[PDB]
A paper describes a structure:
Here, we determine the high-resolution structures of cyclic di-pyrimidine-synthesizing cGAS/DncV-like nucleotidyltransferases (CD-NTases) in clade E (CdnE) in its apo, substrate-, and intermediate-bound states. CD-NTases share an N-terminal core domain with templated and non-templated polymerases of the nucleotidyltransferase (NTase) superfamily, but the C-terminal helical domain shows a higher degree of variation. Three conserved acidic residues in the central β-sheet of the NTase domain coordinate with two metal ions (A and B) that are essential for catalysis. Based on sequence conservation and structural similarity, it is proposed that the cyclic di-pyrimidine-synthesizing CdnE proteins, including ClCdnE, EfCdnE, and LpCdnE, form smaller donor pockets that act as molecular gauges to recognize and retain the binding of pyrimidine nucleotides but weaken or exclude the binding to purine nucleotides.
The native structure of EfCdnE was determined to be a 1.75-Å resolution. When compared with ClCdnE, helix α2 of EfCdnE was shorter by one turn at the N-terminus. The overall root-mean-square deviation (RMSD) is 1.38 Å between 280 matched pairs of Cα atoms. Other significant deviations were observed in the βB’-α3 loop, βD-βE loop, βE-βF loop, and α7-α8 loop. Despite the differences in local regions, the dispositions of the NTase and helical domains were similar in the native structures of ClCdnE, EfCdnE, and LpCdnE, respectively. Similarly, the side chains of Glu267 and Arg279 in EfCdnE are engaged in salt-bridging interactions and would have substantial clashes with the donor base if it were a purine nucleotide. This observation explains why we could not detect the binding of ATP and GTP analogs to EfCdnE in the ITC experiments.
Numbering used by the authors: 2 to 307
């Protein structure tokens, strides 16, 4: 085996939290910025953690926290065919996305300072030394998907989020559904699902750092989604991390080769993992898996000599 079980197990650990209450304090500081801004008094909204921190798959203490600020008193919707807002008694909305984003910008600027707020293409970066906030905030509107289960009941929908990037292109995600499904799979695998996610991400980083393989399209979200598609038996049936990773790579390769990967969803189940507008391709993932296979030396080198 290339790496000992102690080494692999170390690489399955969650990133240490240098500040014990970092997530809670970050959420609280952002919530405080909003709740004390009178212009949000008539609005209903949630501040919640998503991404690696939200899924407890973060592997680097230094990474920034993804925080969603989601407006819910005004929302977007996906309806069944032929239905409109008026079929659910809804208006087009009392506030637009851009107006909401500008209110958020004012609130965050009053809290953290104009020099510590930076609008990016996809999120608003807060770098507040004063309040200990290192966060990428995504202002979003709740996204009510009535079409997925064909619900005519206004209160029955799949809940996602929708925002507009700085180029005014639309982005729809289901971070809460993702988080819930990932928790479920962790519960079904004796907590080994997220351990596997973490070690694969760390091996990706190590392959990049040691000049074995680099591909900027192999994102942390992609890796999490790939491992989530690994059937629970490949995680529950083996007694070493070495073997678990070996079988994971065999399965992913086989699933790309036989085209079953085309039916894989992301963790949320609301979009397919591979399609023509993802950053990655199936070739990217095949390359990643092949390079990890060679890096782990699952085919032992001749005479155990590199």
């Amino acid at each position: 085996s290339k790496f000992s079980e102690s080494t692999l197990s170390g690489w399955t650990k969650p990133a240490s939290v240098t500040e014990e209450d970092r997530i809670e304090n970050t959420i609280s500081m952002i919530k405080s910025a909003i709740k004390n801004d009178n212009n949000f008094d008539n609005l209903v909204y949630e501040v919640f953690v998503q991404g690696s921190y939200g899924n407890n798959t973060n592997v680097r203490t230094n990474s920034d926290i993804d925080v969603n600020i989601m407006l819910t008193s005004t929302f977007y919707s996906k309806y069944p065919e032929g239905k409109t807002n008026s079929d659910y008694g809804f208006t087009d909305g009392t506030i637009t996305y851009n107006e909401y984003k500008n209110l958020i910008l004012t609130a965050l600027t009053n809290k953290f300072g104009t020099g510590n707020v930076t609008v990016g293409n996809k999120s608003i970066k807060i770098t507040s030394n004063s309040y200990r906030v290192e966060a990428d905030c995504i202002p979003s509107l709740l996204y009510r998907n009535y079409e997925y289960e064909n619900s005519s009941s206004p209160n029955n929908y799949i809940e996602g989020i929708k925002y507009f990037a700085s180029d005014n292109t639309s982005v729809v995600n289901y971070p809460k559904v993702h988080i819930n499904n990932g928790i479920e799979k962790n519960n079904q695998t004796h907590k080994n699902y997220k351990r596997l996610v973490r070690v694969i991400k760390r091996l990706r980083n190590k392959m990049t750092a040691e000049n074995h393989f680099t591909n900027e399209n192999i994102t942390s979200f992609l890796i999490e989604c790939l491992i989530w598609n690994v059937p629970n038996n490949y995680i529950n049936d083996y007694d070493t991390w070495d073997e678990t990773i070996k079988q994971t790579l065999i399965f992913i390769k086989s699933s790309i080769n036989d085209n079953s990967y085309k039916n894989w969803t992301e963790v949320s189940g609301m979009f397919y993992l591979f399609h023509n507008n993802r950053k990655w391709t199936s070739d990217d993932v095949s390359s990643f898996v092949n390079s990890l296979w060679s890096f782990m030396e699952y085919l032992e080198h001749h005479h155990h000599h590199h």
